[PDB]
Design a protein around this ligand. Structure first.
Ligand code: QTP
Ligand code: CA
Ligand code: CA
Ligand code: CA
Ligand code: CA
Ligand code: CA
Length: 903
DNA sequence: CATGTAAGCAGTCCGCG
DNA sequence: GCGGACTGCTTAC
């Protein structure tokens, strides 16, 4: 097999590399790497190295990496550019793996672990590590085994061995319901004392050294706890055995509270699953406890136990250990679904970077572009210092707030990367400038053509049309991968709807799920077989289609994120190729494109409807337009449609056969106007929206920019079995909105859009009557809590103190000197509740850590003093009044003359 | 050592015979 | 009690 790296580190003048050799064996080597950098040299000198602008360079080969760094500083002092890759381990990887890396994940050791630490005096701080580690579960991906290290004797209690037989039993039979599929994979190791547990764990670690190290919150808890605990017991050198190179870096961050540490383990790639999740999931959660995320991702119930975690080991050691095991497994289950470890590996090896560098789009692109340019013997420019400078972004149309009955939307494919490719935007393709007219003159096609020679953006930039740019070249490759995966995702989604349709008439038979590839639209013959399947098989097929869809979503959305990240990187001062001319060439072109096509669509639809000057495009944001389709439907007349699906088919055909060609003609003309390299402005129909035929539903509404709701029948070619709400920006979409309120507001919208005013009023009346009976957590607001200390004046709110911060301070006083209460962690999320006047908490609100029950001692008072009136008004009534006033609807029946009668 | 900007809404402070 | 300037937070793209 071809060789591939596992990890790389620079330590002084040495590169330390863990890798897989040609026989599939794990190896380590220390290489005294001799790096090269470059300096501009006189033309006359015959060299083979050129910078990106074609200026000749001379190579400087250094005896070691220190000399190379020292030369960089001398060059800075002289005032001349020091060219080449200055992160030498990227140079090392590029030199060592001068081919496309094909890695074998079954050879890469992926470790998932977590630890337990009983603490009778508050949260066990990793920086102090003053309490025994009393459980470790460490799953190894090569062994496919859960190694369980269990402390039997502790200063906090002596306990019996954990029982695998009891662990396997149903909870309803007093067991722990450790999943049956992992019972046989558990290797259980009890220990009589912590020192031997830890020594054995370290020996184990030596035998089975993680390459990728992950788990839930490992970077801020488990890792520094383990490291510091070992340091305290055995000494720092022993603790450094966690690094295969025996080298660590300890980073301490302090504030007006305590101080935590992050530990860098050289030779390991730590990918905390919480960080992966935040980056790659495109959710925003109200809590990031593993209980909450597992429930959200997998629909499994919270791991329940009685009493405080500080007493769980002594009262129920059996459950304590089982829950440690299940917690490690849940992260594996989330990853089986989401496939973020897979994505990280793909991206890391594609770029030739340390795997943990996938968190940095700047590092990822620097490496990609470096490798691309190195192939052509080109020399990359020196990174420079740039002052931060705001710059203009996209255009958003101001909508008229209203109900909108029939809506069709259109969206440009991968807009910013498509602009890069169309215009040919790259550091080395800049041809010059032209004198700009106001943007409106380009939009209306009245400005003079910018150039008949170069490819242009309305920001004044010109680019060469006849040569390739590294940015367009490399962005296209990732774009093409993204497109492939998005196709798989959409196919799986269409396939799901086929299965949901067939679930309306399940067959009474004993059969099996069909063996199919869900990434491809089902054939007619598969559709025939599906129509004869039982509910059981259909449901299993539906689960599999949805899992296929999720896998496709991970793959495409994060590749989209990467390419869009390149367009944003051009506007980040830390990017080697930072250049506002290019960042701005993109955003300004986008503004033109949106507003140009708005004009073209208005013109086209007025023409085909035989009218003049009417506004069809009601809204647009960045690269999308929303077209009112009322006049289209009225042109033929609603009477003519047999059912909802009929008018949906009609609009679908209209968009594809009439509008899209006109949109295409409009953009091809724009491309000629800007004299661009390649026409890539591809704007396809997205949503078809409307009320069910014959109902009193309003179809959709806008309240303002970035705030709307639509009843959707078809989305990007997926014809839904059941209409689906597309809601953007409204409180239902915000993680700060209480859970039960999100639910209630969404049902309010559903009723407005599908059923009408009366249906809304009936629901509102019910919700208002039942509000007070909802669980307090379901109705609590949520907020992130930054700069808590900043506003903390002897436990009381300083000036301008935010509401949620005030709640935290109220909480801190309520739990003061009471060691069993969970602390609010800076930058994390809190539940928030308003309090009625005169409450024993001495203030107007309380806040506590999100995803948790409020501590038992103050829970009773919170429940008694909660201000339901304020809560209902702020979180529910006020947003709903926004929705209904925009929609020209009432959520409560208004008074009228009819009130004089007895109905 | 590290993607971007646009923009809505809740909240605090201040002005208000 | 509300609106205007301002911060904080969060979402749309
Ligand atoms: C998250 C994020 C970071 C940086 N830029 C972002 C972004 N989301 C959108 N944008 C910018 C770049 C996008 O090209 C543009 C339009 O957003 P949109 O979400 O339409 O995505 P787009 O890239 O066009 O991909 P599709 O093919 O799925 O439509 O808005
Ligand atoms: Ca635990
Ligand atoms: Ca788009
Ligand atoms: Ca599309
Ligand atoms: Ca059937
Ligand atoms: Ca869009």
């Amino acid at each position: 097999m071809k060789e591939f790296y596992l990890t790389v580190e620079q330590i002084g003048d040495s590169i330390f590399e863990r890798y897989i050799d040609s026989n599939g064996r794990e190896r380590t080597r220390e290489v005294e790497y001799k790096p090269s950098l470059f300096a501009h040299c006189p033309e006359s000198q015959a060299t083979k190295y050129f910078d990106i602008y074609g200026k000749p360079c001379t190579r400087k080969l250094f005896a070691n990496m220190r000399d190379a760094s020292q030369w960089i500083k001398r060059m800075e002092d002289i005032g001349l550019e020091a060219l080449g890759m200055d992160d030498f381990k990227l140079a090392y990887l590029s030199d060592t793996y001068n081919y496309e890396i094909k890695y074998d994940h079954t050879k890469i050791r992926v470790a998932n672990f977590d630890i337990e630490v009983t603490s009778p005096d508050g949260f066990p701080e990793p920086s102090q590590a003053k309490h025994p580690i009393d459980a470790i579960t460490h799953y190894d991906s090569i062994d496919d085994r859960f190694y369980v290290f269990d402390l039997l004797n502790s200063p906090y209690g002596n306990v019996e061995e954990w029982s695998i037989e009891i662990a396997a039993k149903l909870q309803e039979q007093g067991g722990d319901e450790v999943p049956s599929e992992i019972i046989d994979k558990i290797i259980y190791m009890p220990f009589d004392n912590e020192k031997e547990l830890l020594m054995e764990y370290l020996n184990f670690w030596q035998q089975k050294t993680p390459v990728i190290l992950t788990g839930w919150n490992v970077e801020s808890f488990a890792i520094p706890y383990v490291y510091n605990r070992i340091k305290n017991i055995f000494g720092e050198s022993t603790a450094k055995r966690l690094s295969p190179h025996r080298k660590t870096r300890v980073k301490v961050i302090e504030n007006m509270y305590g101080s935590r540490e992050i530990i860098t383990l050289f030779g390991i790639s730590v990918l905390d699953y919480i960080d992966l999740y935040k980056k790659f999931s495109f959710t925003n959660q109200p809590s990031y406890s593993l209980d909450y995320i597992s429930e959200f991702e997998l629909n499994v119930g919270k791991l329940k136990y009685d009493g405080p975690i500080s007493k769980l080991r002594e009262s129920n050691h059996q459950r304590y250990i089982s829950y440690n095991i299940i917690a490690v497994y849940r992260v594996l289950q989330i990853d089986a679904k989401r496939q973020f470890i897979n994505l990280s590996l793909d991206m890391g090896y594609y770029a030739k970077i340390q795997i943990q560098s996938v968190f940095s789009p700047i590092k990822t692109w620097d490496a990609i572009i470096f490798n691309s340019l190195k192939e052509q013997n080109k020399v990359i420019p020196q990174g420079r210092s740039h002052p931060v400078q705001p710059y203009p972004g996209a255009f958003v149309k101001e909508p008229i707030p209203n109900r909108y009955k029939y809506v069709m939307s259109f969206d440009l494919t991968s807009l910013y990367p498509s602009i890069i490719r169309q215009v040919n935007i790259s550091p080395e393709t800049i041809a010059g400038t032209f004198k700009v007219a106001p943007l409106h003159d380009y939009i209306n096609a009245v400005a003079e053509r910018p150039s008949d020679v170069y490819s242009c953006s309305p920001n004044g930039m010109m680019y060469y049309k006849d040569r390739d740019g590294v940015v367009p070249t490399e962005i296209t490759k990732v774009f093409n991968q993204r497109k492939e995966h998005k196709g798989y995702m959409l196919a799986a989604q269409r396939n799901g709807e086929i299965i949901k349709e067939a679930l309306h008439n399940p067959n009474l038979s004993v059969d099996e799920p069909l063996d199919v590839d869900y990434r491809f639209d089902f054939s007619d013959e598969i559709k025939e077989k599906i129509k004869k399947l039982s509910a059981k098989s259909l449901n299993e097929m539906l689960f599999r289609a949805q899992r296929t869809e999720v896998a496709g979503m991970t793959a495409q959305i994060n590749r989209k994120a990467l390419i869009n990240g390149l367009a944003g990187a051009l506007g980040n001062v830390w990017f080697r190729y930072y250049d506002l001319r290019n960042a701005t060439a993109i955003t300004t072109f986008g503004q033109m494109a949106l507003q140009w096509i708005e004009r073209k669509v208005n013109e086209y639809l007025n023409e085909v409807c035989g009218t003049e000057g009417e506004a069809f495009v009601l809204y647009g944001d960045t690269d999308s337009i929303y077209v009112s389709a009322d006049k289209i439907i009225d042109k033929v007349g609603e009477s003519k449609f047999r059912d909802t699906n009929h008018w949906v088919d009609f609009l679908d055909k209209f968009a594809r056969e009439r509008m899209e060609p006109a949109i295409d003609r409009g953009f091809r003309e724009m491309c000629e106007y800007m004299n661009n390299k390649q026409h890539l402005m591809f704007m396809d129909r997205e949503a078809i929206a409307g009320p069910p035929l014959g109902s009193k539903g309003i179809g959709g509404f806008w309240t303002g920019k970035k705030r709307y709701a639509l009843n959707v029948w078809d989305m990007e070619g997926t014809r839904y079995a059941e209409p689906k709400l597309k809601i953007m920006g409204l409180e239902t979409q915000k993680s700060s909105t209480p859970k039960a309120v999100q639910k209630a507001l969404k049902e309010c919208i559903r009723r407005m859009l599908q059923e009408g005013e009366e249906s809304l009023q009936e629901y509102f009346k019910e919700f208002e009557k039942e509000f007070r009976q909802l669980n307090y957590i379901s109705i609590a607001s949520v907020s992130s809590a930054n700069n808590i200390a900043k506003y903390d004046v002897g436990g009381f709110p300083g000036p301008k103190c935010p509401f949620h911060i005030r709640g935290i301070l109220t909480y801190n006083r309520a739990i003061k000197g009471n060691i069993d209460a969970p602390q609010v962690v800076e930058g994390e999320k809190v539940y928030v509740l308003p309090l009625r006047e005169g409450n024993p908490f001495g203030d107007k609100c309380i806040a506590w850590p999100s995803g948790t029950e409020i501590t038992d001692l103050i829970k009773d008072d919170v429940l008694h003093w909660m201000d339901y009136t304020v809560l209902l008004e702020k979180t529910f009534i006020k947003p709903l009044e926004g929705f209904t006033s925009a929609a020209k609807l009432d959520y409560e029946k208004k008074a009228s003359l009819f009130d004089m009668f007895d109905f």
